[PDB]
Amino acid sequence: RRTKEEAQETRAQIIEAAERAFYKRGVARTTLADIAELAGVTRGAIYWHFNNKAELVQALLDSLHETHDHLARASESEDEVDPLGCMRKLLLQVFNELVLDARTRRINEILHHKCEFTDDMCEIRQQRQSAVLDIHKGWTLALANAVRRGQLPGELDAERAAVALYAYVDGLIRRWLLLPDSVDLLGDVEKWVDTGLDMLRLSPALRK
Amino acid sequence: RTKEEAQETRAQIIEAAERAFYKRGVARTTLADIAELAGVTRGAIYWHFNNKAELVQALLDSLHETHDHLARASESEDEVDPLGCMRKLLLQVFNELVLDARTRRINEILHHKCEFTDDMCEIRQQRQSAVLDIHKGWTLALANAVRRGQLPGELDAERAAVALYAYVDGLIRRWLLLPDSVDLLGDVEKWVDTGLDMLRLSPALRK
Ligand SMILES: Oc1ccc(/C=C/c2cc(O)cc(O)c2)cc1
Ligand SMILES: Oc1ccc(/C=C/c2cc(O)cc(O)c2)cc1
Ligand SMILES: [Mg+2]
Ligand SMILES: [Mg+2]
């Protein structure tokens, strides 16, 4: 009965339908008019909320980080006493949500496997670059905090370690999406997280 | 001769497919689009490829060729240094990615420009088959390294092959996305050894 609350409901309906449409048919061939029909909204309504498909993809991508922001900011805090432990809790929660939450799984599948970078829609690649650079900045600081607190080797190259951890986690998530019944990500989640952290703690190649 | 002409036509089609897929992506490119870009007519592309998924697979299969010698060596139970063969394999994989325009662009197509959205689902099915085949070979090569004492005796060879694939595949994709951020060629030894150190040293990878 109020403008803002009805707008928020319509926006959520559009995003939910976009996840269903992109997951089934992919981003390239899905139109906003298609998503409007699936959502039960008018074309005027969808173009009111989103200028183009790139803005809907970004809404999906930006929706992933809210769950973990509390543990991420803690790991990045220069006053946090256990930054490596916050990083481990962050990685456990990432994997747990991926396996358990149908929405998170479907969005990750869309971004990994149903969404092309093409220069006719250059914003998709540009916004993915910004998201990964932002993650890298956070993890570089979290790992530097861990080194200062004696939880990681003193000569750790924090930048390269953050890249190595991102490579491993992102590669494991994509492998699981491709071949889920191949790897028990939920049952062995602690093992999978600790494999990545062990690389950072123990590999001499990651020292300066 | 018919045989040499058909081989040249196939190569012309595959080269045009790389150009077309890189520019416009796989989803919206048809075989008819690729044939026009290749200068190939009278329906010849359909004599070479049953559908677009087969052309994607041809690009994917072309990546194995350079590395086959080192991969088979690493998997041979007669090889004396199966971990060293795997190291040389990963060095070449990263070197070719940075140096070879064709390998780089094919990887960019498969990682970033190729939706799992075809009718017969063959694009996803063949990617699954390809990764399972890599996994089978890497599990064998790591099991050979364990047998030679080059990796821990209690290593979970299957999980270690998954962890190494995750790291390597993730690092390649990370580099394709942000090439100015990772000196893949300059520090290639460090990047390869970081991954091999994970398998050699992580207790989480032991049974
Ligand atoms: O494949 C993936 C690779 C990396 C990540 C990281 C997510 C993440 C989420 C946060 O809230 C803070 C952060 O610093 C990182 C998620 C998935
Ligand atoms: O990210 C990756 C990029 C390339 C590869 C190649 C693996 C490979 C496996 C084989 O059995 C034979 C071969 O010639 C290559 C694996 C992972
Ligand atoms: Mg969430
Ligand atoms: Mg090659």
- Smallest Cβ–Cβ distance between B198 and the set A29, A118, A203 belongs to A203
- Residue keyed to tokens 């496997």: A113
Q: Could you give the CA distance from residue B12 to residue B44 in angstroms, rounded to a whole number?
A: 11
Burial of B74 (0-12, 13-18, 19+ CB in 10 A): buried
Residue B195 · residue B164 · CB < 8 Å:
yes
Provide the token pair at A186.
């939920």
Are A147 and A153 in contact by the 8 Å Cβ rule? The answer is: yes
Pocket of ligand 1 (CB under 6 A): A 65, 68-69, 72, 94, 135, 138-139, 166, 169-170, 173
Rg (CA), chain A: 19
Min Cα–Cα distance to chain B from A43, Å: 23
CB nearest to A26's CB, from B115, B177, B205: B115
Q: Which experimental approach was used here?
A: X-ray
Distance of alpha carbon A179 from alpha carbon A100, whole angstroms:
16
Q: Do A114 and B115 touch (CB under 8 A)?
A: yes
Question: Is the distance from CB of B162 to CB of A175 less than 8 angstroms?
Answer: yes
Q: Does A202 touch chain B (CB under 8 A)?
A: yes
Q: A198 by DSSP, 3-state: which?
A: helix
Q: Quick check: B67 and A67 in contact, CB under 8 A? A: no
**Distances in Å between the alpha carbon of B26 and those of A49, A135, B116?**
29, 29, 9
- Nearest Cα neighbor of A171 from A183, A181, A159 is A183
End-to-end Cα spacing for chain A = 61
The answer to whether the CB of A171 falls within 8 A of the CB of A121 is: no
Chain B hits for A91, CB-CB cut-off 8 Å, are none
> Taking a C-beta distance cutoff of 8 angstroms, is the pair B120, B50 a contact?
no
Give SS3 for A192.
helix
The answer to whether B145 touches B200, Cβ cutoff 8 Å, is no
- Residues in Cβ contact with B174 at an 8 Å cutoff, skipping those fewer than 6 apart: A132, A163, A166, A167, A170, B181, B182
DSSP secondary structure code for residue B206 in this structure? B
The span from the CA of B122 to the CA of A63, in Å, is 30
In single-letter form, the type of residue at position A20 comes to R
**Closest by CA position to B107, among listed B167, B60, B71:** B60
* Cβ-nearest to A204 among B173, B197, B203: B197
**Touching check for B190 and chain A: CB below 8 Å?**
yes
Judged by phi (left if over 0) then psi (alpha if -120 to 50, else beta), residue A147 lies in: alpha
- Token pair, residue A192, equals 């999978």
Contact A110, A22 (CB under 8 A): yes
Total residue length of chain B: 207
Å from CA of B135 to ligand 2 middle: 9
Instruction: Tell me which amino acid residue A138 is.
Output: G
**By the 8 A CB rule, do A174 and B124 touch?**
no
d(CA B26, CA B109) in angstroms, rounded, equals: 8
Give the position of tokens 């139970």: B77
What tokens appear for B87 in the block? 């190291």
With beta carbons less than 8 A apart as the criterion, state whether A110 and B113 touch.
no
* B162 Cβ closer than 6 Å to some ligand 2 atom: no
Cβ–Cβ of B193/A203 closer than 8 Å? Answer: yes
Return the closest-CA partner of residue A90 out of A68, A73, A61.
A68
Q: Is residue B88 classed exposed, middle or buried when 0-12, 13-18 and 19+ CB atoms within 10 A define those classes?
A: middle
Q: How big, in percent rounded to 5, are the helix, strand and coil portions of chain A?
A: 75, 0, 25
**Resolution of the experimental structure, in angstroms:** 1.7
Structure letter (DSSP) for residue B155: B
Residues of B in contact with A182 (CB under 8 A): 132, 135, 162
Which ligand places an atom closest to the C-alpha of A103?
3
Write down the number of H helices and E strands in chain A. 10, 0
- Rounded to a whole number of angstroms, the CA Rg of chain B reads 19
Provide the angle, in degrees to the nearest 10, between the axes of the packed helices A123-148 and B157-177. Answer: 120
Cβ of B174 and A183 within 8 Å? Answer: no
For residue B110, what are its two tokens? 């498969």
**Whole-number Å distance between alpha carbons of B108 and B22:** 8
Distance CA A58, CA A27 (A): 12
Please give the DSSP secondary-structure letter assigned to residue A207. B
Alpha carbon distance A118, A125 (integer Å): 8
- What long-range pairs does A60-66 form, CB within 8 A, spacing at least 24? A60/A15, A60/A18, A60/A19, A60/A22, A60/A107, A60/A110, A60/A111, A61/A107, A61/A111, A61/A127, A61/A128, A61/A131, A63/A15, A63/A107, A64/A104, A64/A107, A64/A108
